[PDB]
Structure 1
Amino acid sequence: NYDKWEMERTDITMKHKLGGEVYEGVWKKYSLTVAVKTLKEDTMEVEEFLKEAAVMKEIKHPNLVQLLGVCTREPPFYIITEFMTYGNLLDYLRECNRQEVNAVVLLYMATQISSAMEYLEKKNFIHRDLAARNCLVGENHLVKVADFGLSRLMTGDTYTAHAGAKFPIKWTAPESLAYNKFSIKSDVWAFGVLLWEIATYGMSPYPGIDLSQVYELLEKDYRMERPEGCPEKVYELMRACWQWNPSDRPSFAEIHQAFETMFQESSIS
């Protein structure tokens, strides 16, 4: 009945809708621009809305979108987070000045994301839809993973998604496609694809390839080619993420350490 995260809905003024349902609003007390997720008072997604709120309370990491407060006493239910200025990483990359957002910057963004994912790995969470679209950007190439796609692993290492669930085939690991099973390893695969998105400045993965065939191509060892101007080390990491066997994919700890060193090395140059 008492929750520290619960804030008065009074202290929030809405400014502008951003999608969906998400708004740019203002926490008036702190004169702070915030992001506010909400829902229609006629929805069955109330339970999962609240579950994700609860999850986000447990989450604390620089490269994970920070929860600020909630309004879960009566409709409309709010989840308030910090406001990421530039929106998602996909559109950012597509619209960016590539002279500004160059190689070392891409390395930096990958490093940040892998930090967030290592954190989740440690905390027994998995992200159900890890992609550039669900990474948000702030000033100085700050990247944060959107935490609404998070699921906690209560037992074991494998989250089974609800029966008949749609999933982004090109981002989805083959064991997830075949069995609806998501491990942190599945997220490692997805992160590989995200690396591809970053390197290509937001190209659609497996471009031109009919979705129906995708799985079958992966089974027969087809992987996306190294993007133009992508360092061979990075591509090697991408292929490592796309190992057929989940057990052969690296951990996000390994991945993050790799990108950390690579980034420092590029920073020297």
Structure 2
Amino acid sequence: HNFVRKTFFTLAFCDFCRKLLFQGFRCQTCGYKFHQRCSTEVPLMCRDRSSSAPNVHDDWEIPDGQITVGQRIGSGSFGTVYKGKWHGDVAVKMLNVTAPTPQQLQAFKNEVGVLRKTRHVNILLFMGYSTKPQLAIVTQWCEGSSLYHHLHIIETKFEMKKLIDIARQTAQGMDYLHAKSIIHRDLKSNNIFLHEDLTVKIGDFGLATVKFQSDVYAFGIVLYELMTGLSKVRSNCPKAMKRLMAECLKKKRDERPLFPQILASIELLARSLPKIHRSASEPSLNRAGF
């Protein structure tokens, strides 16, 4: 391994201390980076000073029956999947429990009070709910086909730039949800769908009362399906793609990098491939050591 001096802008973090990295070292091999202060613990394997400010760049309830319901689309863990239409294009989930319990009845009021504010771009926007005959949830219908269908039924392989950008936009979704102190259990492509322009939409985040590292672990398997449709990934793609997957699938929790770091890292992985897309030149002599 050979290392050269470098100053990082925007957002960058250490790889050993796993904290903010402004000015440090970078490795031409496997893109390894580390602080000088944290260099004392860095192996050959692939007076601290403070920092500062970084630059940055009940009417919902609806009656029953009026909706022109469609065909069953799937089967969830705690409900039935359907699509309807009522003054607009929506879809409704037919939940399980016929007679709501008193515990979830009032929790139904607060669960609506919580889900009414989560308005992320890469999540399927909440549209409504109902409990008049039985518990039910209304979720926006995707004006197209889901993620799982595209990559497994009527195969339409996407652009690698599109493929990673899908992961990039997917990264934007789960990261914000964790900022709401929300830990997810059923994060998988079976619950991921593609909207207009095949934009990523993530659902199955409801039932805050009736029902992060594990979420990244689940997110790790999701990104595996993208580049596979570990070593099976394309060699022509930036090698830092393999590194990102490797850290996200660690068995230990805190060893797995958290979502906030990955958003900046994914941006880096989407820059090396276009900036350097050709046969490699020659690297110069190393000028550092420990």
Taking structure 1 as the reference length, the TM-score comes to 0.67
| Alignment match of 1:103 (pick from 131, 148, 160) | 160
Q: Is the 8 A contact 1:85 1:139 kept in 2?
A: yes
What residue in structure 1 maps to residue 265 of structure 2?
258
Is 1:196 matched with 2:228?
no
Q: Amino acid of the residue matched to residue 156 of structure 2?
A: N
Change (3 A) 1:11 1:199: same
- Shifted more, 6-15 versus 41-50: the winner is 41-50
What residue in structure 2 maps to residue 36 of structure 1?
92
Change (3 A) 1:41 1:132: closer
Q: Amino acid of the residue matched to residue 191 of structure 2?
A: N
CA distance, structure 2, for counterparts of residue 150 and residue 42 of structure 1? 16
CA drift of 1:52 comes to: 6.0
What residue in structure 1 maps to residue 195 of structure 2?
138
CA distance, structure 1, for counterparts of residue 65 and residue 194 of structure 2? 28
Is 1:227 matched with 2:210?
no
CA drift of 1:90 comes to: 2.1
Q: How does 1:127-206 map to 2 (within 5 A)?
A: 127-148=184-205, 184-201=212-229
CA drift of 1:252 comes to: 0.9
Counterpart secondary structure, 1:80: strand
What residue in structure 1 maps to residue 53 of structure 2?
none
Counterpart secondary structure, 1:253: helix
Taking structure 2 as the reference length, the TM-score comes to 0.62
CA distance, structure 2, for counterparts of residue 41 and residue 67 of structure 1? 21
| Alignment match of 1:70 (pick from 98, 113, 129) | 129
Is 1:246 matched with 2:253?
yes
Q: Amino acid of the residue matched to residue 129 of structure 1?
A: D
Change (3 A) 1:243 1:253: same
- Greater share of helix: 1
Structure 2, unaligned stretches of length 5 or more? Answer: 1-57, 278-290
Is 1:92 matched with 2:147?
no
What residue in structure 1 maps to residue 45 of structure 2?
none
Cα RMSD between the aligned structures?
3.0
CA drift of 1:253 comes to: 1.3
| Alignment match of 1:124 (pick from 174, 181, 190) | 181
CA distance, structure 2, for counterparts of residue 76 and residue 89 of structure 1? 30
Q: Is the 8 A contact 1:88 1:136 kept in 2?
A: yes
Change (3 A) 1:42 1:71: closer
CA drift of 1:84 comes to: 1.3
1:1-59 deviation digits (Å, cap 9, x = unpaired)? xx13213436522122212211111122xxx2211111245477994994765543242
Counterpart secondary structure, 2:142: coil
What residue in structure 2 maps to residue 18 of structure 1?
73
1:87-134 deviation digits (Å, cap 9, x = unpaired)? 432222123322xx1201111110111111110121110111111111
Structure 1, unaligned stretches of length 5 or more? Answer: 153-161, 163-183, 202-223
CA distance, structure 1, for counterparts of residue 111 and residue 141 of structure 2? 18
Is 1:113 matched with 2:170?
yes
Q: Amino acid of the residue matched to residue 140 of structure 2?
A: E
Q: Is the 8 A contact 1:90 1:197 kept in 2?
A: no
CA drift of 1:228 comes to: 3.8
Q: Amino acid of the residue matched to residue 267 of structure 2?
A: E
CA drift of 1:200 comes to: 1.2
- Higher radius of gyration, 1 or 2: 2
What residue in structure 1 maps to residue 287 of structure 2?
none
CA distance, structure 2, for counterparts of residue 83 and residue 267 of structure 1? 35
Counterpart secondary structure, 1:15: coil
Aligned residue pair count:
209
CA distance, structure 1, for counterparts of residue 113 and residue 269 of structure 2? 35
CA distance, structure 2, for counterparts of residue 200 and residue 53 of structure 1? 38
Q: Amino acid of the residue matched to residue 240 of structure 1?
A: E
CA drift of 1:78 comes to: 2.5
Counterpart secondary structure, 1:68: strand
